[PDB]
From Swiss-Prot:
Binds 1 Mg(2+) ion per subunit. It comes from the Eukaryota. Belongs to the HAD-like hydrolase superfamily. MasA/MtnC family. The gene is ENOPH1. This is Enolase-phosphatase E1. Monomer. Its EC number is 3.1.3.77. The lineage of its organism: Eukaryota, Metazoa, Chordata, Craniata, Vertebrata.
Length: 254
């Protein structure tokens, strides 16, 4: 509710915090499965697409031992028939990786390039709860710095903020962090985030919906608040009593 005087930075989780889970789980990711074949068919000749498929082929070779693994065999030729077969293999491999929650760099890389087309072309918009932007603006007016921490790549994060239901709000963010800085349930990740930002762990207030993230940040001597939004995983009675909860960014007083 009332931020400690020592806080100078607000670190924000995305899914379940600034953005509903429904958008991420039922819109953002399913979009990939629905568009990967069309995307590959249309942009196969692109140097970037060729590089993406190259990475996916390498990954497919490394997963060859896994049961149910989908191979991306060497093309049979360079005719349109051979290409159709190739494309199907890549599509099948991508969907397979997504069915299990395998978030490899090869997969994330292609997803990011596909999302760039979706958001830039205005086919999709990143959903933010109505209280987010106004609160963030006031926070910044009060001198607070604002950073984002999500498992989604920074490149993908920028697309979300650049094409939100609130328009382009990239300027409201001072920086982004993804799994490169470490995993969200590891306290060490938060100590590094403080280092990258250029502050102390105690100058940070992290807002997240998952308690496993909250407890990891607390262990890193970071201040935390648990955000409750529609569709979020329930909190235990003890967690509801232990953590400071907020149902809106407006509930935070500086
Ligand atoms: C661009 C990808 C989706 C990002 C939504 C996420 O926040 C997931 P996570 O809960 O791993 O931080
Ligand atoms: Mg979350
Ligand atoms: Mg440090
Ligand atoms: Mg202290």
């Amino acid at each position: 509710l009332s931020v400690p005087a020592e806080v100078t930075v607000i670190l924000l989780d995305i899914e379940g915090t600034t953005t509903p889970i429904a958008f991420v789980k039922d819109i953002l990711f399913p979009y990939i499965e629905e568009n990967v074949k069309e995307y590959l068919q249309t942009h196969w000749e692109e140097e970037e697409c060729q590089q993406d498929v190259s990475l996916l082929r390498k990954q497919a070779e490394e997963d060859a031992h896994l049961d149910g693994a989908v191979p991306i065999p060497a093309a049979s030729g360079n005719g349109v028939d051979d290409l159709q077969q190739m494309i199907q293999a890549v599509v099948d491999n991508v969907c397979w990786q997504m069915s299990l929650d395998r978030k490899t760099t090869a997969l994330k890389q292609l997803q990011g390039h596909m999302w760039r087309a979706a958001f830039t072309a205005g086919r999709m918009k990143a959903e933010f709860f109505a209280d987010v932007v106004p609160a963030v603006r006031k926070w910044r007016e009060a001198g607070m710095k604002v950073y984002i921490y999500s498992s989604g790549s920074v490149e993908a994060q920028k697309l979300l903020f650049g094409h939100s239901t609130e328009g382009d709000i990239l300027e409201l963010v001072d920086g982004h962090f993804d799994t490169k800085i470490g995993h969200k349930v590891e306290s060490e990740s938060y100590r590094k985030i403080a280092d990258s930002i250029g502050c102390s762990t105690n100058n940070i207030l992290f807002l997240t919906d998952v308690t496993r993230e909250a407890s990891a940040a607390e262990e890193a001597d970071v201040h935390v608040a648990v955000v409750v939004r529609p569709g979020n995983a329930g909190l235990t009675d003890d967690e509801k009593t232990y953590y400071s909860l907020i149902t809106s960014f407006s509930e935070l007083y500086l």
